[PDB]
Structure formats: C-alpha cells, structure tokens
C-alpha cells in the first residue's frame, strides 16, 4: 500500500526504444519528476495478443530485457503489471503437460473441460458474452491423439483457467508471490469478468461469485504487499462495485465524457460525474486499447454518446464492435473507437492540455499513456503493416523520435502539468468541486494550508491553475 | 449504529385519526414488531405548506398533541423529524420582531434583504432555480410603514434564513438542541439546497459552500446524538455527495426506477443501480410529496423516463412541472408525478408486494409511507375539497378505516414483509446482488449463518423469499 | 364451395332480445336477403369469459334457448359455431371428476399437469406467450386435500386441454360430431395457437406441431361436413400458413388497415394488402373482441400503426395491453383497441359505409358484427357496470331498440350494401384490383357477363358502385 499519489506512465516494454533499458533511459532523463509510477504492459513470454497470452508470469521475455531491467524501475517508481487471471498460454508448462499426460496430468484440473457441461442448448449458447462469432471452445489433440475441447474465450493460444479447481488459486498465488518479490505493488487483473463459467448465464461478471474471486485475489495480493486494479469494460456500476470492495476501479468513463465535454463545450455531465465518481480509481484518458463506449452509458445520455461516436468516427479508423451488432449508428453496437486521444481532440493543444488538467484534478491516481505523453497522432502506416486495428494507437517510438517530440510545446506544457500534479501537496487532501456555468469546469484540492484550483473555460480551452506557495502564504498562478 | 436497521413509517401527526395519541395507538396495536422507527411530518405550529412553515421547532401544535405525545414514541422507536434549515414562518417570533423593530431588531440579520444585492441582471435573475413563476422576493411593511424586500423561495409565509449571518446557525443549533433533547435521533434537512444565495449562480446547491453548511449541521447533530438526512430532489450525484460526507442520502431514484422496472418487466437498469447505489441511504417508494423525476435521470435512460411519465400521466392527476417548461413529454419538464404508489402500480397486489420486497432488500433503512402501508388509492375527492394536487397522496384515515384497511390481504402481506425485514438478522450483514436475466431480480443478505434470498419475476409479479433458520440450519420459505 | 359466398352476421345468442328465438325473429324480419349465414357466439353453459368457458359443447344454455332454436337458423342459413380447442370449464364433467378423483380419474390425462415439467427456469418462464400478468398455472385442491397445479392460459375457470393425450382428441371429435349433427357447417377454432405446450418455447404456435393438430381437426371437420375457421391473433404470416392448409383464415389485418386508410386518406398500404391478401379468408371489420394490432404489423408501417393508436386511444376507452409493456404509444405494447368501429370512424356515416363497401369487395366471405350492423356507439355504461372493457363493444339491444336502429339511414344504406354483396353474381367470379392514386381505392369483381365496380374517394368519403344487369347488358348504379 502507500502507493505514491502521483502521475503514472502506461507503456509497452519495447515501444519506446527497443527494450526495457531504453525505456528506463527515457523515464530517468525526462520523467523523474513528472511520474511516480509505471504500468508496463505485459513483458512475459507470450505467444499471442500483444503479450496477454503469457507462458509464465515468472519470466521476463528475453527480447525486451531481464528481471534486472524491471527492478531498475522498482527502485524509484511504483510498478503496475498485469496478472492474466482468466487464461494462460497453450505453450505454458501447465498446458503442455496436459497435452503430454492428458487427464493423468496434475494440471488437468486447472483447465475447463467442455464435456462436463453436456449438451448446451442454442438459447444458452447465445447468452455467452464473447466478441468472437466462434463458440468459446478449442479442440486440442493430446499426445496419444485423443481430441478434447477446452474452454477458450479469446485467441486459440489463450486457455481459460478453471476456478472450480483449487489449482487456479495456487497458480495465481504462485504468480503473485513471484511478481511481488520483484517489486510489483499494483496488480492489474485482466479479464477478471470471464473467470466464472456457468451454463444458463452470460459467463461474464456473474454475481456474487465474481467478487468472491476478486476478494481472494485481493487478499493474497495484500499478503504479498500489492494492491489490485481489476479491469472491466462495461457499465460504470461495476467500477463502483470494485471500489466498494477496497480495490482500485478504472476511470474508463472519463475519456469519452471528457471528449464530449470539450467537443461540445458542455460541463454538465462531467460535473455530475465528478460529484459521484468512485473513490480510489486509476484515471485514464487513453490506454493501450481504444476509447471504450460501454463505460460511459448512463454517465452520458445516449444521444450525446451517439454524437461523440459520429464526430470521432470521421477522424478514426473502423471501431471495434460487439458481435453481430449491425447498426453502427447505435451506442449498443460500438465497443471501442480506434483513435489517439490527440486526434479525437483534433490535435488542439489547448483542448488536450485542458483534458489532462481536468484528469489530473479528478480524484484518484492519473495514468498517462505513452502515445498521449508525446501527443501522438493516428499511426496509419503501422496499422497497414501489422494488420491490427489497435496499432493505430500503439506507435513504435525511436529514441530520436522521443527527443523530437519531447520538445514539442504541447508536450512541454503537459510535462509541467505532470510535475505539478506529482509534487504539489494539495492533491493529498480532499477534493472540492466548485460551482460553474454549463460551459466551464472548476475543481480544487485542499490539504491544510495547501490549496490548488483549476478553472477550464470549455469555449476557449483556456486552463488556469492557482496554488498556494509551500514556502509562502501568497497564492500563485501555474503557467500550464 | 445509532439507528435501528428496521422499517420506518412516514406519517403525518394527524392523518391517521385526528392527533398524535391516535397515531400512537395505531402504531402500538399493529406496527410494534413491524417498524423500529417513525418519521412524523412537521407537527410544529405552522401557517403554510402542510407544516413546513414553522413558527418554531420548540413547540408541538396544540391541535395535534403535546411534546409528551411525541416522547411516547421515543421510548420504543427511533424518531425522525424535519428541520427546515432554509426558512421559518413570517409569524415566527424572530420575523415578527423584525417587522416590529425593523432593522433595529436583533433578529434583522437572520433574514436575506434583497437591496444588499443591488440591481440584479436579467441574466442573473434567470439563473435562480425556483419552481414558482414569481420573483423570490417579498415586500413586507415594517411597523413604521416602510417597505423592504426579503427573499422567500416558497410561499409568502416562509421567509428564507441568511447563512451569511451566524444568527442562522445559532437558531438551528438552538432547534437541534431542543429536538434532540425530546428524543429525535434523525434530522431531515428540508430544502437544504437553497441555503446558499449568491448572485451569478443558481442559488441552489452551490458547491462547495452547500457542503460546508451540511458539515456544520452534521457536527452539531452528532454532538446532540442525532444523525442527518438531508433532502434534495435533483441529480442522483448529490446523494453520493451526501453519502461521502457521512450523512444519510435518500433513495429517491428507487421509486421511478422500480415503477418502470415492474411496468415494463425489465430489471437491467434496476440491477445497475443496486450494484452502485449509495451507502447509508434511507429508501422510499412513496413519500408525502410525489414521485420525483429528476432523481432518476441517468439512472434510467431518457427514453424510459418518457415511457414512465406518459404511462402514469394517462391514468393520474396533473404532474407538478418545472418552471415554464412547455413540453409535457420531456423529462426536463416534469418535476413530480401525482399518483399513489399502489395506483401507480395499477392496484396490482402482487406487483406492489414485489416492489416493497425489492425496497426492503435494497441497502439502507426502508421507509414506508402511511398511504402505501394501507395500500390506499388516489384520493381525487380530497384534492377537490383542498384544491391541492399533493392531497391525492395524502388521504385522511379514520380509526375505523385503518382497522378495515389493515385487514386487506395485500396489507397483511406487507406487514409480514415488514416484520421479517425489521427482525431478520441477515439484513445486518452484507448485501449480495445475484445474477439474473433481464426480466427478474435476485438479491440476498448474508450475516454469518443467517442468509435470506429474494427472487422476483417481473413478468408474472411473483415473489420468492428464502431464509435460513440458524438453529435448524435449514432453508425456509417466507410466504409473501 | 361448402359455404355461401354471402354476408354473415356475428351475434351473441342473447344480445338481440333475450334469446335465440328473439334473434331468429330479427334475422328473418330484416336480414333474410342481406345475409346467408350466422356466427353465433357461444350458447353453451359457461362460467366465464362471455361464453368461452363451456362446460360442454353438447348443451344449449336454457336461458338462451334450445337445440331446436339453433336448428331453425341451420335450415335456411350457414351456421358458424365456436369450438374451444384449447380449454374447457373447470365445472365441466371431466374436470370435476379430476377434482374428485385426482390422478386416478379417467380424465386426469385430459388436463396439463405442471409438475411433470419439473423445475422451470426463469428464462423458460419468460418465453411463455400469455397476455395475463399471472403465471399460467392454477393451484387446485383435490377432494383428498392435495394441492396440484394445472395449466390455465386465460381465466381460472378455463382449464387448458393436453394434446399429448388421446383423450383431448376424443373429446374434440365428440364435440365436432355433435355440433355438425345439429347443422353447423363452420367451426371456429378458438385460441388454437395455445394448444402446444413445450418448455423452452413460447408455448404459442409451436411449428410444425400446431399444424399437425390443425390438420387433424380439419380432417374430422370435413368428414362431418364442416369447414374450419381457426382464430389466431398474431403476425399475418400465420393466416397464410392457415390458408395453405385448406382452412379459412381471418382477415384481421383489414380493420386496423382500413381505419388508418380512412382516417388519413391513404390507400397505398390497403392496395398492397388487397393485392396479396390470403385466399378463402373470412373478413371482419368489428368482432366481439377489440381491434387487434399485432395482426396488422408488417401490413402497415409501425409509424402509421402508431398514428392509428394515438388517434383512437385519445377518444376511446383503455386498450388491452400486451403483458408488462409500459410504453402506451408503442406498437409492441398494444394488443387491442377497445371501441366500436362506428366510433373508431368518428360516427361518420359515409366513411363507415365506405369501409363496409371495401370489406364486401375484398376477396373472401365478409362478416358483419351486430353492433356494426346497427351502427352502435361505445357503451360506456355497460362497461362501467360490468367491469369488462370489451363490453363497450357488446351492447345489449332490446327488440324495440333494434326496430328503430334498423330504420337509421346509415343502417338502411348498409343493409342495401349487404343485399347487393350477398346476391349479385359477380362476387362468385374473380377479383380485380384496379389502378388508383394514393387517395382512393378501385376494386372490381367479374363473373362472365356480371361485373361490378367499387370506387371510394378517401378524401371525401364518397362511394360509387356500378354493376351490369345481364339482360340489359347495361351498367347501373347501386344506392350506397
């Protein structure tokens, strides 16, 4: 616990420079005052899906670096790493052993064997919540040639763990203990919503079993010195459910709501959300994924969400959709919009700095995506070569490119904002939303004598920060 | 816990029988096991607005009873009474002295004097959030015959208190001290959103000043042994703001949400709210007021509120509207629907018990309005004699009427639910929302060995309640 | 053709006068040339639902008459009688035996016993297609004192038959054999869609089992010299499925379609329907029930149906709704509109006569409801006294009331229209839809030299009928 209440950077292990050592150089050169922590997307050996199919959580993939490169970070920064509670790779030791020894294997129970369910009705099959149009089963061939089907939610390389079996808990406890020994204090629980499988249900976020699993993961992480950040993309009510269980929710509602507020110069729905937002959240504008719509339902009226989708889709590549949706003009249809936050704001520096300041004054720990940190645009060339829609938001940066972009004026304004947010003591106090008209936002933090106040005029995208000098009583105005 | 986690009754002092002694006899005869607490609508001497224009909070109106009639409840029951933080009667001693001695009066500062603001721009006049189509100023003639204007938000007999002056706090502290000495442990802060007046703002729920007033009232209440229930009809986010400040919010979102959920056999929105609902709330289905629409915005999509409004209005009396709102079919236009909750549910007994069952299983202290307790219908005849729309929901019950209505089968079902909710120990534990389809709701409470489960099928209006008998160790079914 | 291609009357046995003899006297006095047939609503002993809970089909209720009174109509006229294939009364001999002897009774298999299905999941309960907001089960106490549940779709007095047992088929064949022996040639199969019960389905119109039951009844009917008119209120496609079964469907699409056509002066959807209308269909404008909306879906665009609903409901009594469907302005929500056809047309004599003229020219045998025959208005007092909404369209006519209403000019116009339709030979030929603009309809019938033409101007509600007289070979104009 006692994670630093400072800005955090979200980055790949190899997207800045070529490896963890190059990323460390950039962080130490420019971000030593700007951030207190890092979320490094999965650096384990993985055979699919951008690192999210790990063979093990106990090894660092050699192509990106070593466990020593990771620990260089744990010295100065908080470290947040993924724990893929839902699945492990088919090349993992446990699954390859299941292929080798079949149902005789000790890890046989660790996986979900479809035959236990029996015949599943068409109605019950339709209920299962998956984006893929293919049943969530993979047929695998054992070494003797027997053909058996195991539950597989995502790519064929990812094999879902069976939380009916105790082995899944031992496997999770084993990973958590190793990771925390490396100095990880924040565990991002990926795809936790899929861990419970029950025919006749959605097989997504089944209550109350989902919280019983979450509570166990949270208790074990506490054993080992780590807090938890469970990840769900769905209705905002689940972030509240996470918050109530003393875990960190994600502020996924903030990006689309802030996008709408700046594009329309409306503050009403943003202020309503700030007044009721969950207490211990990690806030984001952009992530490694894409700007997610379901997390804003209820937070934004449906018509406003449709307006945001129609506005953004002109400046973006094709959105990621929920399965067989059909009518793109529908909020229900769209899962994620693929664009860089800067492109969504139309590359207006004042609008982008306004968004980052509002995020930074929002309760919770603010996380800055590396593409956003450098004010990156949509990477159309990478999407064409990789064939992956999300790569439009995952540009590979050369060290020289980072030096060129760090000097950009919009990035310089952002860096001073991050240093203020990371160091000024008022943010350790309590949050006071202030009265404002429907076209501006007023936010403030108070800690004893320390006080900082943010005013954003959404019409003109002007950002004004006033603070109390730590050395002196007189108030001061941050350049922003 | 200072308050009992049991059902509470909301009643007038004189609407069951003619006085507080008649109310006590009814509570003692039929409700002694059913409720742990009582909210009595204002019993002070008052010249307007159904008791909410109190000359003083230190007296009981002689026509309804005596302070001793009040203490008869305080021995066996928790007691919730209103404190009208915003305004006091013009016949109050403080205001009457102000008319007598003018600005020489020691009480002159207690009121808001319009001339201090000077000229008010039409733009600043438009911002002021009040329902009446009249300016919130009233000219009064002092004894010497000079005319001066004081601010008054509601009827002309209610005169707003000035929270710029310490006299307002002193008065409230005086009221809080007297009320708590009589045995009031829960203070409903009526219309607190109006207490801050600032030109250039709405003069409603001005942040962060409105919470500074709330904190002082809460601290004073706590010193005297009372908790606070501040009352706001507005966006649900204000209830979260109250909950965060360790006060009891109102579950005003629940009535419109349940009505839509039962009328349309849809549980989706209700489960989203139950998953994130605020922590220490007092829940209601019907109140003395009317089913209020702004409290459900965002909780229900705009389309569904429109559906609910048109459905109820087609079979009910005229709604209360927001000031000068032309469109009847707009959410923005309707402030309150005038209907009895039993009539809002079409006098379907099964639907009504299902609604109360869901309220009782919702986290927080459930409050039952006296009209709904007797499953009363719309009183159009009372409205015609009175000239008031709110009286459709404020029927006068004769003692003989109460005995016949208590006997109605639907009321007997409700009483059995209230006894179970008020006494079963699982409710002192934690809440477990359960997975269900989009036409049913499944809720449970667990406290160690105690466990109770509610299943409601919204298509067929069936209620199933299962509970465990700890000594037996076996599940039992509570008939409902 | 087994039936005459002439107008038919739909009437109660006791709604004209007090009995069947009174009805016979009115038919013989005024309709001997106007009509060729009669549909007499149930005259059996029945304990619910306006004669549709028959104790037996082999007895005539003594209050309405005797079997000889039925046989009077048969000798000069076609007779259409209901066969309640789905259910029989709980007072029936077969069900009374089951109450007495329980599962030992010879008739136990005749009813549907809910416990055989076992635990029914909430999803499977939700699929069941029933209008009432209650579960489709009725708990009954056997004389031994046991409580068991039997399936019942409608009122508790109607107990659904079990078509998995042979006893149900033996019961129906016995009814059909008796009814035809009395001279009935048309059997209306009431609520036939409910006969198939399968958990996991809607339990409504389960294909192809529903047609196998339909084929069985038709074979029994044809052997005994009767044709079948199965009654289903749902999508038009079911009328086509019935038509291709060599059975007479109902033209239920026509009443709502014609009402929109006349109220909005639009003929396009009507001509689209007339061009593809199902063959061998009995057409209606008004029935003993209310005007049914689902039968017009797809035939009319949803927006126009919405226009019709809002128009009618604004000036009429409450509609019957589909189960738990909040949205009163929605097509999905509304089952039936409760108002007479004359009132549905604003008591406009020209529009009403034009509607009947179009009906009589539509392919198939036209049926005229007795209230429409006398141009009856909404009967609010009968509905106020009965408590049954449908009674607004089921007025009781005294014999003297009939004598003056027959004399009404709009009724005399209709009578001349019925005589022309019942007797002119062209209607026995082939039907020719004619070109017209979107404001008028032109329909024709040709049989050899006989030819008649109908032109309706929907803007001005003018009716022109031209026919040829074969000996003259000269076009003539018919008063209408």
> How many Å apart are CA C344 and CA C259, to the nearest integer?
7
Would you mind telling me the total number of residues written for chain C in this entry?
480
Q: Does residue C190 have an active-site annotation? A: yes
CB contact under 8 A, B311 and C327: yes
Torsion of CA A251, A229, A50, A347, to 10 degrees: 20
Q: Which of C90, C231, C343, C350 is catalytic?
A: C231
Q: Which of B201, B301, B432 sits opposite A435 (nearest CB)?
A: B201
How distant is the Cα of C133 from the closest Cα of chain B, in angstroms? 5
β-pair type (C78-83, C440-447): unpaired
> How many Å apart are CA C452 and CA C466, to the nearest integer?
5
> If you write DSSP's letter for every residue of B24-55 in order, what string do you get?
HHHHHHHSTTT-SEEEEPP-S-BSSGGGTSBS
Residues 6+ apart with CB under 8 A from B223: none
Radius of gyration of chain C (CA): 23
Q: Compute the half-sphere exposure of residue C219: CA atoms within 13 Å on the CB side of its CA.
A: 7
Closest CA to C369 of C113, C103, C35: C35
Burial class (CB in 10 A: 0-12, 13-18, 19+), B344: buried
From residue C208, how far is each of C214, C234, C241, C245 by CA, in Å? 10, 16, 11, 12
CB C39 within 8 A of CB C10: yes
CB B337 within 8 A of CB B287: no
| SS3 annotation, chain C | CCCCCCCEEEECCCCECCCHHHHHHHHHHHCCCCCCEEEECCCCCECCHHHCCECCCCCCCCCCCCHHHHHHHHHHCEEEEEECCCEEECCCHHHHHHHHHHHHCCCHHHECEHHHHCCCCHHHHHHCCCCCCCCCEEEEECCCCCEEEEECCCCCCEEEECCCCHHHHHHHHHHHHHHHHCCCCEEEECCHHHCCCCCCCCCCCCCCHHHHHHHHHHHHHHHCCCEEEECCCCCCHHHHHHHCCCCCCEECCHHHHHHHHHHHCCCHHHHHHHHHCCCCCEEECCCCCCEECHHHECCECHHHHHHHHHHHHHCCCCCEECCCCCCCCCCCCEEEECCCHHHHCCCCHHHHHHHHHHHHHCCCEEEEEHHHHCCCCCCHHHHHHHCCHHHHHCCCECHHHHHHHHCCHHHHHHHHHHHHHHHCHHHHCEEEEECCCCCEEEEEEEECCEEEEEEEECCCCEEEEEEEECCCCEEEECCC
Q: What region, left, alpha or beta, does residue C153 occupy, with left being phi > 0 and alpha being psi -120 to 50 degrees?
A: alpha
CB contact under 8 A, B458 and C324: yes
- Cα–Cα–Cα angle for A437, A443, A445, rounded to 5 degrees: 155
> How many Å apart are CA A61 and CA C171, to the nearest integer?
77
Query: Binding site for substrate: which residues of B?
Result: 194, 336
Element (H, E) at B420: helix B409-423
B261 to chain C: closest CA residue: C326
Closest CA to C125 of C295, C324, C333, C336: C324
Q: Which of C14, C90, C91, C190 is catalytic?
A: C190
SS3 A472: coil
CB contact under 8 A, A123 and C123: yes
How distant is the Cα of A412 from the closest Cα of chain B, in angstroms? 32
Residues 6+ apart with CB under 8 A from C429: C445, C446, C447, C448, C450
CB A43 within 8 A of CB A64: yes
Closest CA to A154 of A303, A302, A46, A24: A46
> How many Å apart are CA A238 and CA B471, to the nearest integer?
36
> How many Å apart are CA A38 and CA A22, to the nearest integer?
14
Take residue C242 and report the two structure tokens written for it: 């019935």
Closest CA to C461 of C303, C355, C341: C355
SS3 A279: coil
SS3 A400: helix
* Torsions phi, psi for C158 (to 5 deg): -90, 125
* Residue A430 forms contact with B (CB below 8 Å): no
**Which residues make beta-bridge pairs with C148?**
C140
Q: What DSSP designation does B380 have?
A: H
In A32-183, the DSSP E strands lie at: 37-40, 78-83, 87-89, 137-141, 147-151, 158-160
Query: Binding site for substrate: which residues of C?
Result: 194, 336
Over the range C138-161, which residues count as b (16 or more CB within 10 Å of their CB) and which as e? bebebeeeeebbbbbbbbebbbbb
Q: Does residue C209 have an active-site annotation? A: no
* Residue B196 forms contact with A (CB below 8 Å): no
> How many Å apart are CA A179 and CA A192, to the nearest integer?
18
Report chain C residues whose CB lies below 8 A from the CB of A121: 200
Burial class (CB in 10 A: 0-12, 13-18, 19+), A191: buried
> How many Å apart are CA C346 and CA B412, to the nearest integer?
47
In B48-106, the DSSP E strands lie at: 78-83, 87-89
β-pair type (C282-284, B365-369): unpaired
* Torsions phi, psi for B11 (to 5 deg): -150, 155
Closest CA to B98 of B152, B156, B150, B170: B150
Please state, as a whole number, how many other Cβ atoms lie within 10 Å of the Cβ of residue A23.
29
| Cis preceding linkage at A174, omega within 30 | no
Which strands make up the sheet holding C282-284, listed edge to edge? Answer: C227-230, C186-189, C78-83, C37-40, C8-11, C365-369, C282-284, C250-251
Report chain B residues whose CB lies below 8 A from the CB of C131: none
Report chain C residues whose CB lies below 8 A from the CB of B437: 122-123, 126
Take residue B33 and report the two structure tokens written for it: 């096991």
Closest CA to B83 of B56, B61, B63, B65: B56
Q: What DSSP designation does A110 have?
A: G
* Torsions phi, psi for B36 (to 5 deg): -110, -5
Residues 6+ apart with CB under 8 A from B367: B7, B8, B9, B10, B39, B282, B283, B284
For CA atoms A8, A10, A11, A16, the dihedral sign is negative
Q: Which of B237, B273, B275 sits opposite A275 (nearest CB)?
A: B237
Helix axes A349-361, A409-423, angle to 10 degrees: 10
Place of tokens 């800045």: A16
SS3 A105: coil
CB contact under 8 A, C326 and B436: no
CB C10 within 8 A of CB C370: yes
List the resolution, Å.
2.4
Residues 6+ apart with CB under 8 A from B284: B10, B250, B251, B252, B254, B255, B359, B366, B367, B369
Closest CA to A408 of A455, A363, A347, A469: A347
Closest CA to A283 of A306, A314, A254, A263: A254
* Torsions phi, psi for A172 (to 5 deg): -70, -45
Report chain C residues whose CB lies below 8 A from the CB of A123: 123, 200
- Chains near C, with 3+ CB pairs < 8 A? A, B
> How many Å apart are CA B468 and CA B420, to the nearest integer?
12
Element (H, E) at A211: helix A209-223
CB A181 within 8 A of CB A144: no
In A66-138, alpha helices (H): 67-76, 93-101, 122-127
CB B153 within 8 A of CB B194: yes
> How many Å apart are CA B63 and CA C84, to the nearest integer?
64
β-pair type (B440-447, B430-434): antiparallel
* Residue C198 forms contact with A (CB below 8 Å): no
Closest CA to C28 of C16, C14, C44, C15: C16
Report chain B residues whose CB lies below 8 A from the CB of C134: 350, 460-461
Burial class (CB in 10 A: 0-12, 13-18, 19+), C446: middle
Take residue B394 and report the two structure tokens written for it: 């404020």
| Cis preceding linkage at B134, omega within 30 | no
SS3 B19: coil
Place of tokens 């205001």: B95
Q: Which of A22, A90, A231, A343 is catalytic?
A: A231
Instruction: Report the greatest alpha carbon distance in chain B.
Output: 79
| Cis preceding linkage at B208, omega within 30 | yes
SS3 B402: helix
Residues 6+ apart with CB under 8 A from A2: none
Torsion of CA C34, C38, C43, C48, to 10 degrees: -100
Take residue B220 and report the two structure tokens written for it: 């004073």
In A105-165, alpha helices (H): 122-127
C314 to chain B: closest CA residue: B314
Q: What DSSP designation does A147 have?
A: E
> How many Å apart are CA A414 and CA A345, to the nearest integer?
15
> How many Å apart are CA C45 and CA C386, to the nearest integer?
19
> How many Å apart are CA B142 and CA A344, to the nearest integer?
62
Q: Compute the half-sphere exposure of residue C147: CA atoms within 13 Å on the CB side of its CA.
A: 3
A201 to chain C: closest CA residue: C123
Q: What share of chain A is helix, strand, coil (3-state, %, to 5)?
A: 40, 20, 40
> How many Å apart are CA A32 and CA C172, to the nearest integer?
89
Would you mind telling me the total number of residues written for chain B in this entry?
480
Take residue C461 and report the two structure tokens written for it: 């509600």
Contacts of residues B424-428 at CB distance under 8 Å and 24 or more positions apart, as own/partner, are B424/B450, B424/B452, B424/B467, B425/B450, B426/B450, B426/B451, B426/B452, B426/B467, B426/B468, B427/B5, B427/B452, B428/B5
> If you write DSSP's letter for every residue of A21-38 in order, what string do you get?
HHHHHHHHHH-TTT-SEE
CB contact under 8 A, B461 and C133: yes
């Amino acid at each position: 616990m006692l994670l630093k209440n400072a800005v955090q950077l979200i980055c790949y292990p190899d997207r800045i420079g070529n490896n963890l050592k190059d990323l460390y150089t950039v962080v130490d050169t420019h971000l030593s005052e700007a951030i207190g922590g890092l979320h490094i997307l999965p650096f384990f050996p993985s055979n699919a899906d951008g690192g999210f199919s790990p063979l093990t959580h106990k090894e660092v993939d050699p192509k990106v670096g070593t466990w020593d490169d990771i620990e260089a970070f744990t010295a100065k920064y908080d470290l947040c790493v993924d724990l893929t509670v839902n699945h492990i790779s088919d090349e993992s030791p446990e699954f390859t052993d299941f292929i080798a020894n079949g149902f005789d294997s000790e890890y046989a129970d660790l996986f979900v064997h479809v035959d236990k369910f029996g015949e599943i009705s068409p109605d019950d099959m339709a209920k299962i919540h998956i984006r893929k149009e293919k049943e969530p089963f993979r047929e695998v061939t054992l070494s003797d040639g027997t053909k058996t089907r195991v539950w597989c939610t995502f790519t064929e390389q990812q094999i879902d763990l069976n939380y009916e079996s105790d082995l899944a808990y031992q496997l999770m406890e084993s990973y958590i203990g190793f990771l925390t020994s490396k100095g990880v204090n924040l565990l991002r629980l990926d795809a936790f919503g899929y861990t419970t499988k029950r025919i006749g249900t959605s097989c997504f976020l089944v209550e109350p079993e989902v919280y019983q699993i979450l509570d166990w993961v949270n208790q074990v992480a506490l054993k080992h010195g780590a807090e938890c950040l469970p990840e769900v993309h769905d209705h905002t009510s689940y972030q509240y459910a996470i918050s109530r269980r003393n875990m960190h929710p994600y502020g996924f509602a903030l990006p689309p709501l802030l996008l709408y507020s700046l594009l329309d110069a409306n503050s009403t729905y943003l202020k309503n959300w700030l007044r009721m937002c969950p207490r211990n959240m990690v806030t984001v504008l952009d992530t490694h994924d894409g700007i997610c719509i379901p997390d804003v339902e209820g937070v934004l009226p449906d018509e406003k969400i449709k307006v945001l989708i129609d506005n953004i889709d002109a400046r973006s590549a094709d959105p990621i959709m929920r399965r067989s949706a059909a009518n793109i003009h529908s909020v229900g249809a769209i899962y994620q919009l693929t664009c860089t936050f800067y492109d969504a704001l139309m590359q207006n520096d004042d609008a982008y700095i306004a968004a980052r300041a509002i995020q930074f004054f929002t309760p919770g720990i603010p996380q800055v995506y590396y593409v956003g940190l450098l004010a990156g645009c949509n990477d159309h060339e990478l999407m064409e070569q990789s064939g992956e829609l999300r790569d439009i938001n995952r540009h590979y940066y050369t060290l020289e490119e980072v030096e060129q972009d760090i000097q950009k004026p919009v990035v310089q304004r952002l860096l001073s904002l991050m240093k203020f947010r990371s160091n000024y003591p008022a943010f350790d106090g309590h949050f006071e939303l202030n009265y404002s008209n429907n076209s501006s936002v007023a936010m403030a933090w108070r800690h004893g004598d320390y006080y900082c106040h943010l005013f954003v005029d959404l019409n003109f995208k002007t950002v004004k920060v006033t603070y109390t000098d730590v050395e002196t009583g007189e108030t001061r105005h941050l350049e922003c």
